[PDB]
Amino acid sequence: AEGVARVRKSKGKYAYLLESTMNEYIEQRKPCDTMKVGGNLDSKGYGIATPKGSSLGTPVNLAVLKLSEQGVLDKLKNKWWYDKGECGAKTSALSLSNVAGVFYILVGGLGLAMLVALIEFA
């Protein structure tokens, strides 16, 4: 949170090096001025830790693989990362509103010109 806050209060002078997961999480959070750039510097992973020589190690290992093959882990990630995302969630090269505002200022012109005409004949 300190790193993220330092990026946001740094005015873009500070870059935060962090694991991709947390970065993907924060990229979905308000004020939504932050993002992840480039590919990962390396390839690592999270794992369930057990004391060396534990009776619980083998079943939790096979359990992890079991949950992974049936795709529950990815659904869980979508649940806690992308489902509630405030920033994320209509993408095209062109948006009218750039060329559209002139329609409104033109209407300003039509109404004002019409008005001055009205006061001219009055």
Binding site: V7, L17, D33, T34, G39, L41, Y46, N61
Partner: peptide, 17 residues
């Protein structure tokens, strides 16, 4: 075995336009 795969990345500030 990894239940989640990740890697060290870079977070930068991109302003809303």
């Amino acid at each position: 075995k990894p239940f989640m795969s990740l890697g060290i990345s870079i977070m930068i500030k991109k302003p809303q336009k």
